[PDB]
Design a protein around this ligand. Structure first.
Ligand code: NA
Ligand code: NA
Lengths: 251, 251
């Protein structure tokens, strides 16, 4: 069966109560493809998770932007997976490029987080991706495979995992990634999954594109054979996010 | 004028919606010394900040357990100081020992956070403290002074700062800190402030004790000349927190 298209919206470290209410109302009024065609997840900052979950349309789902690596306790400032489950938040983003680079999250730390979140029943958007220096050194797939392997070594069931490929090399660097360049990475990553996990896991796991997505490239990216959707950044705060969801429709 | 006694409760990475409602109700029913005698701050995880702020008695105040180092934006998983201001959360804990050690927050990173939070109007509980290895090497005041200096170099107004000394050496190590040992550190730290900032800042800044505080030591600690209150850990989730607040009363 064909993989269901997946559109996640990562709000990042943005939002006020007033803006969140406007964003949620615009999402609630949106008219998008059916639940059989597209799965939509939105990811507010921690402090807005209860507000968004309480007010968002029930056919769109909520994700935290991170969670802690293990059971809660004496970890000042952290939010545990079981807290998210208590608040009925079904998804979490883990290993985002900004946390790997700025907050120095290692590939093994990310892998441990994925395993713990899955064990607590959360669904996970697990992020991977290489920098410009890594790409220009010829290391794109070496890096992406190593990041993915640290997760795969700790995952026994991929049902509740979506992989997001972030072309960090093409985010704020002056380089523009083409749909063909996205497809090349997604294809090679899926082939890696087939060999290192199983053919079935490769065929069924969504691999979503986490680069710049907009009206000029969303249909072109979404129609690539190994691109199963998007992890959207700044447009996720804006009405433009709705048009990105609509790219799931192929009439 | 005498420094107003200060009792903060750090819930750490603990809580469910049901438990938070019970904790808040118990605080709301508590009968404690007047606002002229004691200032009380409670610190839930990010996901419970709106719930606690909306339901807690108006004479107790709410703190976040951390915030980001600068303006928000592309910092997946982080919560900015301006978000906390938008949600009417007046306080933040910064530099907690667990974030310095487990999350590798450097002294300069903590200092930058303190400065940014203060600039956005937040009040700050700024935490310092030495490990057992540091203490046994003779480095207690070297470490505490260096941590404090990184903050002081970035602070021009201390009005909205409270310093918390955490005896990390006596937390989970088999060593028990005495009230005299707490007083020694607090006195030396205040003397450092007098020389490196000003006599007025030393005389007016609360320095609270962040070790183990309970019915067996709270009056003894609180009565020390240079101990101005407590940053409480696990008891902050429990009715025992109320008896700790009551230690502010010296009849
Ligand atoms: Na596709
Ligand atoms: Na005292």
């Amino acid at each position: 069966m064909a993989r269901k298209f997946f559109v996640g919206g990562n709000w990042k470290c943005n939002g006020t109560a007033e803006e969140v209410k406007k964003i949620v109302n615009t999402l609630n009024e949106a008219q998008v493809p059916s639940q059989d065609v597209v799965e939509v997840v939105v990811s507010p900052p921690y402090v807005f998770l209860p507000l968004v979950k309480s007010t968002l349309r029930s056919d769109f789902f909520v994700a935290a932007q991170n969670c802690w690596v293990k059971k809660g306790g004496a970890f000042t400032g952290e939010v545990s997976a079981e807290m998210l489950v208590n608040l009925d938040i079904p998804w979490v983003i883990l290993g985002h490029s900004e946390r790997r680079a700025i907050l120095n999250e290692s590939s093994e730390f990310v892998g441990d987080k994925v395993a713990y979140a899955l064990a607590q029943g959360l669904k996970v958007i697990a992020c991977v991706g290489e920098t410009l220096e890594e790409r220009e050194a010829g290391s794109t797939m070496d890096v992406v495979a190593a990041q993915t392997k640290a997760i795969a070594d700790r995952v026994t069931n991929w049902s509740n995992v979506v992989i997001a490929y972030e072309p960090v090399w093409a985010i704020g660097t002056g380089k523009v990634a083409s749909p063909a360049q996205a497809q090349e990475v997604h294809d090679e990553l899926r082939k890696w999954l087939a060999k290192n996990v199983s053919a079935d896991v490769a065929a069924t796991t969504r691999i979503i594109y986490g680069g710049s997505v907009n009206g000029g490239n969303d249909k072109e990216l979404g129609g690539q054979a190994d691109v199963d959707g998007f992890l959207v950044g700044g447009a996720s705060l804006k009405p433009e996010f709705i048009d990105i969801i609509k790219a799931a429709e192929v009439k």
